Structures are given as C-alpha cells and as structure tokens.
Amino acid sequence: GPVPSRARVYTDVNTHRPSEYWDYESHVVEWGNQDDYQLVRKLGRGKYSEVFEAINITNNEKVVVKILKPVAAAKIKREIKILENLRGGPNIITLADIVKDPVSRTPALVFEHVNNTDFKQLYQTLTDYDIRFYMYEILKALDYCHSMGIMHRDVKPHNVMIDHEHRKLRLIDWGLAEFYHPGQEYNVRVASRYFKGPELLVDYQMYDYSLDMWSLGCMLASMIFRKEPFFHGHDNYDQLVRIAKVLGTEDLYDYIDKYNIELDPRFNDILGRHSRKRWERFVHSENQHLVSPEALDFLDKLLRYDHQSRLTAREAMEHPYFYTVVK
Ligand SMILES: Nc1ncnc2c1ncn2[C@@H]1O[C@H](COP(=O)(O)OP(=O)(O)OP(=O)(O)O)[C@@H](O)[C@H]1O
Ligand SMILES: COc1ccc(C)cc1-c1ccc(CN)cc1Cl
C-alpha cells in the first residue's frame, strides 16, 4: 500500500509534551458568564457556526462571538484545546472566553475583535512591500502553531484578519486544526478547494504541517499574479488538473510513485500530459509591480507536489523575498 511519511520538523512535539496538551477529549472546559456579552450584529454564518460582533459589558470592548452549530458541537473540545494551547502566540487570534449560548444551548467562543480591512480592498491595493510584510506575519503564526504540534489545515484569505491601519494580522478559524502525530492518517476532506494540497487531492492521508505551506503558496500566487484563485478547479478532480497544467504531470507521477499512491482511475481521461511552466509565463503588465526573481523563487519552493520538499515556515522566513521587510 502507500509508503508512510512523517514531517521533517516538529515530529516529536506532541510526545514530548504531557498528554493533557494534545488529549483534547480529556479537557474540562472552564465556562464563563454569557451575560458579560451583548450581541450587536450578525457578521456571518457558515455550515459550522454563526458569528456575531458583540460588546463585553465588563470593559466595553468589542469582541466576536462564534456560536457553534450542533454539527461543530461534537469536535468543539479540539478547537478549544488548540486555541488555549496557542493563546498568546504571534499573530494567533486570542480566545477571550467560552460560554454556553442561552438560545442555541451550544458553546459560544468569544474572541478578541480585529477591525478587518475589506478583502477586495486588501487584494486590490496591497503593494509589493505590503505583500512581503504580511506574508512574514502569516509565517510567524504558522511556524508558531507547527512548533506547537498543530496544523491549521484551512489557510486561506478569509481566515486571515488584517487590520491594515495598525499593520496587525491574525490567523483565525481553528475549527479544522489538528494535532500532528507521526504516522497518523488524517481526513483529506480539509481546506477550501482552491487551497487543497496535492496530498489531499490524491487521497494521501499521512500528511503534516507542510499542507499549510501549499495553501500559503496558493495565496501568494493569486496575490502576485493577480489571478484569483490561482488554481481554479471546477471540482476536486479538476483542481489537480489545474495544478498539473502549471507544475507538469511528470513531477506528479514521480510524487505518486515515491509514496506508492494509485491515482483514482477517473484521472486517466482528464489529466493529460503537461510540462512544467516557468513562473515568468504568468507575468504581465498588470502584475509586474508585484513580481520579482525572489518572489518567483519563494513561490517555486512552496508549490511543490512532494509535501516533504516544500519550505517549512521557519525556512520560508529565511528567504531572500523577505530581506526588504523591516524587522
Ligand atoms: N476575531 C474576529 N474579529 C473580527 N471579525 C471576525 C473575527 N472572527 C471572524 N470574523 C468575521 O466573522 C464573519 C463570519 O463570516 P463567515 O462565517 O461566513 O466566514 P467567511 O469569512 O465568509 O469565511 P468562508 O470563506 O469560510 O465563508 C467574517 O466576515 C469574518 O471576517
Ligand atoms: C490572497 O490574499 C492574500 C495573499 C497574500 C497576503 C500576504 C495576504 C492576503 C490577504 C489575506 C487576508 C485578507 C482579508 N481577509 C486579504 C488578503 Cl488580500
């Protein structure tokens, strides 16, 4: 069957720490007082929660309340444990409290509020310098959570809050996050379609932190090339074909051969034969201001089929693309 895989970094973090750290089912939730929070306006609703802007009436500060839907209410302890483990980490959203919502009768997570600049506004106006600056801030969050034995598994622009006025970034929505345990087979139905790593698309379950680095590369590619999303698949199968049209099919076959993966036979009639395209093919007069040889080299080192060959977050922080960013 498939050849096993393990991360090249932070493999022993969970075994080294006490069981109480990663054994989220044994965690006893410390409930706060729901009356401390007055809901102001509904910000959104997904398949897993309803999100509200609120006021913490004990200090009059703005907060965000995520009232979990019963479908999410099963794996609530995992999100809570991850948020508590990562609390205070660089660019990690702060979990301020956990309360029982009086209406839904489910847990409601209370987070610090971030005055998030419009996504269209950020996508359309971030300069070359700002992209480098914010990419470095995301890497601080990813290296922290990976160093803490956790993979986010849903890295995408909607999960990155940016308060552009205060040059403040937060990585949010830890609902899909998991503890990395070497040799564990994980569910491949994670991340959003356009950000799914090839490991997910070929059904390779023994993945790790490096899945987040692929998703980060997808964000960077869309941003520097002005191509939203970069890999625009119609479904999960066409998603791999879109990747193969850029990275080529030869390296895809080398990847599946290395891990002894057998592609779904439905790929035989859609994948075709494609060479790798040089990153400069995507440069044009409307994106040339965001592209540089350093940006292309950095992107090249993230967007690799082989999850073990991608830069780790800490290696990525060493890249020449960030030399211009003030530290
Ligand atoms: N800590 C926070 N501070 C401010 N706003 C937040 C915070 N956490 C979540 N939000 C906002 O809550 C809203 C809820 O929207 P929703 O649940 O539909 O997610 P989303 O951003 O649309 O992501 P997706 O693309 O997965 O739908 C979003 O507009 C998001 O920006
Ligand atoms: C493709 O987007 C991004 C790509 C790269 C970087 C550094 C940031 C972003 C980015 C992150 C969050 C938001 C707002 N939710 C908006 C944007 Cl444009």
Short description:
This protein is an alpha+beta fold and 327 residues long. Helix content is 33%, strand content 15%.
What features would you highlight for this structure?
Transferase(Phosphotransferase), domain 1, 5-stranded antiparallel β-sheet, Phosphorylase Kinase, domain 1, alpha+beta, 2 domains, 12 helices, 9 strands, binds adenosine-5'-triphosphate, 327 residues, 33% helix
**CATH H-level homologous superfamily name of the largest domain:** Transferase(Phosphotransferase) domain 1
Strand order of the largest sheet: 1-2-3-5-4
Report helical residue fraction.
Answer: 25-40%
In terms of structural class, how would the helical and strand content be classed? alpha+beta
Organism: Homo sapiens (Human)
Family: Belongs to the protein kinase superfamily. Ser/Thr protein kinase family. CK2 subfamily.
Protein name: Casein kinase II subunit alpha
Catalytic activity: L-seryl-[protein] + ATP = O-phospho-L-seryl-[protein] + ADP + H(+); L-threonyl-[protein] + ATP = O-phospho-L-threonyl-[protein] + ADP + H(+)
